[PDB]
Write an enzyme that holds these catalytic residues in place. Structure first.
Site, mmCIF file in Angstrom:
data_model
loop_
_atom_site.group_PDB
_atom_site.id
_atom_site.type_symbol
_atom_site.label_atom_id
_atom_site.label_comp_id
_atom_site.label_asym_id
_atom_site.label_seq_id
_atom_site.Cartn_x
_atom_site.Cartn_y
_atom_site.Cartn_z
ATOM 1 N N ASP A 224 48.563 -19.187 35.387
ATOM 2 C CA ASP A 224 47.428 -19.808 35.728
ATOM 3 C C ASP A 224 45.930 -19.883 34.945
ATOM 4 O OD1 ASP A 224 46.621 -17.287 36.407
ATOM 5 O OD2 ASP A 224 47.134 -17.574 38.278
ATOM 6 N N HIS B 222 39.773 -2.819 12.882
ATOM 7 C CA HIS B 222 40.522 -1.436 11.243
ATOM 8 C C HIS B 222 41.432 -2.354 10.836
ATOM 9 C CE1 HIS B 222 41.431 2.305 10.125
ATOM 10 N NE2 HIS B 222 42.457 1.371 10.345
ATOM 11 N N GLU B 223 42.296 -2.998 11.793
ATOM 12 C CA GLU B 223 43.449 -3.084 11.849
ATOM 13 C C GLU B 223 43.594 -4.108 10.853
ATOM 14 O OE1 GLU B 223 45.874 -1.337 12.394
ATOM 15 O OE2 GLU B 223 45.231 -0.184 12.985
ATOM 16 N N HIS C 69 42.698 -3.961 7.640
ATOM 17 C CA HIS C 69 43.966 -3.940 6.786
ATOM 18 C C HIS C 69 44.302 -5.159 5.720
ATOM 19 C CE1 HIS C 69 43.925 0.211 6.657
ATOM 20 N NE2 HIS C 69 43.853 0.846 8.099
ATOM 21 N N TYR D 21 47.984 2.668 -0.269
ATOM 22 C CA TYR D 21 48.136 3.603 0.578
ATOM 23 C C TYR D 21 48.920 4.913 0.649
ATOM 24 C CZ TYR D 21 46.925 3.334 5.548
ATOM 25 O OH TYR D 21 46.458 4.363 6.733
ATOM 26 N N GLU E 160 41.712 3.344 4.138
ATOM 27 C CA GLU E 160 41.295 3.571 5.140
ATOM 28 C C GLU E 160 40.001 3.415 5.215
ATOM 29 O OE1 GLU E 160 42.524 4.838 8.553
ATOM 30 O OE2 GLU E 160 43.632 3.503 8.114
ATOM 31 N N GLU F 65 31.284 6.378 15.256
ATOM 32 C CA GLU F 65 31.957 6.674 15.511
ATOM 33 C C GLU F 65 33.184 5.710 15.710
ATOM 34 O OE1 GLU F 65 30.832 10.206 16.666
ATOM 35 O OE2 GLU F 65 29.289 8.913 15.836
ATOM 36 N N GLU G 36 35.762 5.317 19.779
ATOM 37 C CA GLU G 36 36.025 6.058 21.272
ATOM 38 C C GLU G 36 36.289 5.434 22.602
ATOM 39 O OE1 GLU G 36 34.068 4.671 18.693
ATOM 40 O OE2 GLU G 36 32.983 2.877 20.038
ATOM 41 N N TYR H 202 40.619 6.817 23.500
ATOM 42 C CA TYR H 202 40.277 7.834 23.206
ATOM 43 C C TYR H 202 39.690 8.754 23.875
ATOM 44 C CZ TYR H 202 40.771 12.378 20.499
ATOM 45 O OH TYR H 202 41.208 13.340 19.430
ATOM 46 N N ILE I 44 37.736 12.513 28.487
ATOM 47 C CA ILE I 44 36.378 13.201 27.831
ATOM 48 C C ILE I 44 35.758 12.338 27.491
ATOM 49 C CG2 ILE I 44 36.318 14.764 25.805
ATOM 50 C CD1 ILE I 44 38.833 15.985 25.390
ATOM 51 N N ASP J 95 49.686 12.817 5.934
ATOM 52 C CA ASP J 95 49.266 11.929 5.826
ATOM 53 C C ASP J 95 48.890 10.673 4.879
ATOM 54 O OD1 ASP J 95 47.872 9.621 7.431
ATOM 55 O OD2 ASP J 95 45.813 11.216 6.867
ATOM 56 N N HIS K 69 44.387 9.269 6.167
ATOM 57 C CA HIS K 69 42.938 9.423 6.866
ATOM 58 C C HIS K 69 42.036 10.279 7.299
ATOM 59 C CE1 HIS K 69 46.082 6.940 8.680
ATOM 60 N NE2 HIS K 69 46.222 6.515 9.114
HETATM 61 O O1 LIG Z 1 48.434 4.347 9.321
HETATM 62 C C1 LIG Z 1 48.473 2.857 9.782
HETATM 63 O O2 LIG Z 1 48.526 1.940 9.481
HETATM 64 C C2 LIG Z 1 48.141 3.479 11.466
HETATM 65 C C3 LIG Z 1 47.020 3.796 11.547
HETATM 66 N N1 LIG Z 1 47.017 3.466 13.016
HETATM 67 C C4 LIG Z 1 46.121 4.858 14.115
HETATM 68 O O3 LIG Z 1 45.336 5.217 13.058
HETATM 69 O O4 LIG Z 1 45.819 4.219 15.342
HETATM 70 C C5 LIG Z 1 45.060 4.535 16.062
HETATM 71 C C6 LIG Z 1 43.784 3.096 15.521
HETATM 72 C C7 LIG Z 1 43.697 2.573 14.984
HETATM 73 C C8 LIG Z 1 42.159 2.270 13.961
HETATM 74 C C9 LIG Z 1 41.441 2.918 14.282
HETATM 75 C C10 LIG Z 1 41.656 4.349 15.445
HETATM 76 C C11 LIG Z 1 42.513 4.731 15.628
HETATM 77 C C12 LIG Z 1 45.533 3.101 10.648
HETATM 78 O O5 LIG Z 1 45.306 2.286 11.303
HETATM 79 O O6 LIG Z 1 45.839 3.090 10.000
HETATM 80 CA CA LIG Z 2 37.248 9.876 25.627
HETATM 81 CA CA LIG Z 3 47.527 -15.543 34.967
HETATM 82 CA CA LIG Z 4 32.970 2.760 17.906
HETATM 83 CA CA LIG Z 5 31.144 1.914 20.394
HETATM 84 ZN ZN LIG Z 6 44.413 2.129 9.165
#
Ligand SMILES: O=C(O)C[C@H](NC(=O)OCc1ccccc1)C(=O)O
Ligand SMILES: [Ca+2]
Ligand SMILES: [Ca+2]
Ligand SMILES: [Ca+2]
Ligand SMILES: [Ca+2]
Ligand SMILES: [Zn+2]
Length: 316
Positions: free
Chosen positions: A59, A142-143, A146, A157, A166, A187, A190, A193, A197, A226, A231
């Site tokens: 829908d 972020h993704e 990449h 990497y 990164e 940050e 947030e 995560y 908290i 890593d 990271h």
């Molecule tokens: O290692 C990789 O390629 C996957 C890894 N993924 C990851 O850290 O997931 C949690 C997250 C992603 C973006 C921002 C905050 C937290 C990365 O993207 O770096």
């Molecule tokens: Ca939190």
């Molecule tokens: Ca729906």
């Molecule tokens: Ca942020």
């Molecule tokens: Ca924010």
């Molecule tokens: Zn990343």
């Protein structure tokens, strides 16, 4: 699929209502035809086979709790698309309007998100460390970033080139967060995560050391976890980028901030015209200096600030 472009309404992971571009053909699909060759969002259905099923809805209404991660992955992909287009004149991640694909509900209790070389992929999290990851706009950007880096500088990497990789995703994820202008900050993660908290995040650009990440070259990680700390040592570059924009004094080195827009401009140019797959921190400094010089002149404030920021983090 083929069909008519429509507009759905749904709720995101954080309970916020938003409009999404959909495609109608018997069902309402998560297919935005308004941006490039399209934005496509899929249901991985708690499994790991990708992409899974193009998200179909009866829908054009997306208020079920199950819908929410798809809602945000779809919406936030569109926002990120807009940033690169309106701000950098870049059309999708390859510069030629490639289709952007995302899958959500990947696996079970999956506390992670990633770019798999072809598409974005989001876990739901376990509800303790993460709630569904597409809920964070800086995560989504972020993704997708990449993907941009892979098509441009192609930073491998691992080690310093990897940490640069990164930082670039953290930098542009943040700049996209500011672009959409809902609770923006320096940050990372947030919004999705640790729901128990308040105030925390996965990483900090303003103060990397808040989470155990180096904010100076002399504190770089040199072991093998890593992929040589991609990271972790990204904090050094994250801090430099923070300084270039906001300014401040760090380890006794003063930096005149020049603001977000110019940070974006300098780094986008660095990424797309000067960085190569094996670039280290030192070559990143040179890339950024030459970018700032191209854009503002060798005696500009912008150039002097780039130099001060990298000095501040111990990168010559
Ligand atoms: O290692 C990789 O390629 C996957 C890894 N993924 C990851 O850290 O997931 C949690 C997250 C992603 C973006 C921002 C905050 C937290 C990365 O993207 O770096
Ligand atoms: Ca939190
Ligand atoms: Ca729906
Ligand atoms: Ca942020
Ligand atoms: Ca924010
Ligand atoms: Zn990343």
């Amino acid at each position: 699929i083929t069909g008519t472009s429509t507009v759905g309404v749904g709720r995101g992971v954080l309970g916020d209502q938003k409009n999404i571009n959909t495609t109608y053909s018997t069902y309402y699909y998560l297919q935005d035809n308004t941006r490039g060759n399209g934005i496509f969002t899929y249901d991985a259905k708690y499994r790991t086979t990708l992409p899974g099923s193009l998200w179909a809805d009866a829908d054009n209404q997306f208020f079920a709790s199950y819908d929410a991660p798809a809602v945000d992955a779809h919406y936030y992909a569109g926002v990120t698309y807009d940033y690169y287009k309106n701000v950098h004149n870049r059309l999708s991640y390859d510069g030629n309007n490639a289709a952007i694909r995302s899958s959500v509900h990947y696996s079970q209790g999956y506390n992670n998100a990633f770019w798999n070389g072809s598409q974005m992929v989001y876990g739901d999290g376990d509800g303790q460390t993460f709630i569904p990851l597409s809920g964070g706009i800086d995560v989504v950007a972020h993704e997708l970033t990449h993907a941009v880096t892979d098509y441009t500088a192609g930073l491998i990497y691992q080690n310093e080139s990897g940490a640069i990789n990164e930082a670039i995703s953290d930098i542009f994820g943040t700049l996209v967060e500011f672009y959409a202008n809902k609770n923006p900050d320096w940050e990372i993660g947030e919004d999705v995560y640790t729901p128990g908290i308040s105030g925390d995040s996965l990483r900090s650009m303003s103060d990397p050391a808040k989470y155990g990440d180096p904010d100076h070259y002399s504190k770089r990680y040199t072991g093998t976890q890593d992929n040589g700390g991609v990271h972790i040592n990204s904090g050094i570059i994250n801090k430099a980028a923070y300084l270039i924009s906001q300014g401040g004094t760090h380890y006794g080195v003063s930096v005149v901030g020049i603001g977000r827009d110019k940070l974006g401009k300098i780094f986008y140019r660095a990424l797309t015209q000067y960085l190569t797959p094996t670039s280290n921190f030192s070559q990143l400094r040179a890339a950024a200096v030459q970018s700032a010089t191209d854009l503002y002149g060798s005696t500009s404030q912008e150039v002097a600030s780039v130099k001060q920021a990298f000095d501040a983090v111990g990168v010559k």
